[PDB]
C-alpha cells in the first residue's frame, strides 16, 4: 500500500478514498483536480518530503490508471462486424469507378486487429478513412485529391442534432475515458443509402475507440513525464547530503522510469524497504 512521510493519517486515508472514487468521477486527472496537488502541502513540510509524497501519489495514480485501462475487445468486435457489413454493402453497391472502390473495400477487408493498443488506433483510423472515402464516393459528394491532404473523418450527411449529440458524448468520453457509453445510436433507413448508415455506425464506433485510446495515451504521457521530473528534482535535493540512507534512496530513485513495468518496479522497491530511507527525511 502507499505510504509517505510527514502527513496526518486522516488526509492520507482521505486521499486513498479519493483514488477509490476514481472511476465514478468526471474529468479524472490530477491536472483537473488541483485539490489533490495542494493536499501535498506547499508550506507544510520540508522540500524532499513533499517531493517524495508527490512522487508516491503520482506513482500510485499511474499504477491504478494502468490497472483500470479498459480492454475494448467487447466494442472492438462490434467494430469488426460493422467493418464486415460495410465491406459487404460496398461490394454490392453499384459504383461507377469500380477499381478504386474495390481497392478501398479491400483495405476495409484487411483491418482486423492485433491486440496492440497503438496498432489498434492506427488500424481503426485506417478503417475510418477507407469507410469515409467509400461513403463520399457513394453519395458522390466531393472528396480530396491533393497530395498529403488525405481523407478526413466525418459523419457524412447526418442531421445537426445527431452530430451535436455525438460531439457532446465524445467530449464526455475524453474527460472520463474509463467508463464508455456507446449509446448515440438512432440511425434511420428512411433517409440516405444503407451504405451511408453502415459507414456512419462504423465511424461512430471507430471515433469512440480512437478518442478513448488517445486520451489514455495523453494521460500516460503526462503521468510518466511528471514522474520523471519529480524524481529528478528529488534526486537533486538528495545529492546534497551524503549518507548511507541517502545513498540507498538515490540508488532506488535512480531507475529510469519511462515504462509501466519500470514504474511498478520502482513502486515496489520504494514500498518494500520504506523503513530504511525514511531515516533521511525530516517530518518538517
Amino acid at each position: 500500500s502507499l505510504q509517505f512521510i510527514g502527513l496526518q493519517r486522516r488526509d492520507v486515508v482521505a486521499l486513498v478514498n479519493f483514488l477509490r472514487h476514481l472511476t465514478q468521477k468526471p474529468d479524472v486527472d490530477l491536472e483537473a483536480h488541483p485539490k489533490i496537488l495542494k493536499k501535498c502541502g506547499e508550506k507544510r513540510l520540508h522540500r524532499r518530503t513533499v517531493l517524495f509524497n508527490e512522487l508516491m501519489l503520482w506513482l500510485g495514480y499511474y499504477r491504478e490508471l494502468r490497472f483500470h485501462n479498459p480492454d475494448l475487445s467487447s466494442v472492438l468486435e462490434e467494430f469488426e462486424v460493422r467493418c464486415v457489413a460495410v465491406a459487404r454493402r460496398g461490394y454490392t453497391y453499384p459504383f461507377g469507378d469500380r477499381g478504386k472502390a474495390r481497392d478501398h473495400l479491400a483495405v476495409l477487408d484487411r483491418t482486423e486487429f492485433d491486440t496492440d493498443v497503438r496498432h489498434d488506433a492506427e488500424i481503426v483510423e485506417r478503417a475510418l478513412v477507407s469507410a469515409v472515402i467509400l461513403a463520399k464516393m457513394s453519395v458522390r459528394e466531393t472528396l480530396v485529391t491533393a497530395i498529403g491532404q488525405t481523407e478526413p473523418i466525418a459523419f457524412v450527411h447526418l442531421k445537426d442534432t445527431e452530430v451535436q449529440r455525438i460531439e457532446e458524448n465524445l467530449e464526455g468520453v475524453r474527460r472520463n475515458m474509463f467508463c464508455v457509453k456507446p449509446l448515440d445510436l438512432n440511425l434511420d433507413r428512411h433517409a440516405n443509402t444503407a451504405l451511408v448508415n453502415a459507414v456512419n455506425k462504423l465511424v461512430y464506433t471507430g471515433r469512440l475507440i480512437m478518442n478513448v485510446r488517445r486520451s489514455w495515451e495523453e494521460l500516460e504521457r503526462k503521468c510518466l513525464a511528471r514522474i520523471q521530473e519529480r524524481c529528478k528534482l528529488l534526486v537533486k535535493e538528495l545529492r546534497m547530503c551524503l549518507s548511507f540512507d541517502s545513498n540507498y534512496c538515490r540508488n532506488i530513485l535512480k531507475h529510469a522510469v519511462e515504462n509501466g513495468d519500470s514504474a511498478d518496479t520502482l513502486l515496489e522497491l520504494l514500498i518494500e524497504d520504506f523503513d530504511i530511507y525514511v531515516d533521511s527525511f525530516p517530518q518538517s
Partner: protein, 49 residues
C-alpha cells in the same frame, strides 16, 4: 522544382547564385578541386604555404 501550395501544384524557378550549386553529376567535386588548383596556379599559389 514543383511545389505544393494550398492543395495545388505550382512550379518554382530560382537562380543558382553560385557555381557550386550545380548538381554533382554535372559539376563533380574533383572537377572543383582541379579548378581550384587552376585558380591557385593563376595566383602563383600552386604550392600553398
Amino acid at each position: 522544382t514543383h511545389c505544393q501550395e494550398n492543395s495545388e501544384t505550382v512550379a518554382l524557378c530560382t537562380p543558382r547564385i553560385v557555381i557550386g550549386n550545380l548538381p554533382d553529376g554535372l559539376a563533380p567535386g574533383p572537377f572543383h578541386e582541379l579548378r581550384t588548383w587552376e585558380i591557385m596556379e593563376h595566383m602563383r599559389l600552386r604550392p600553398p604555404p
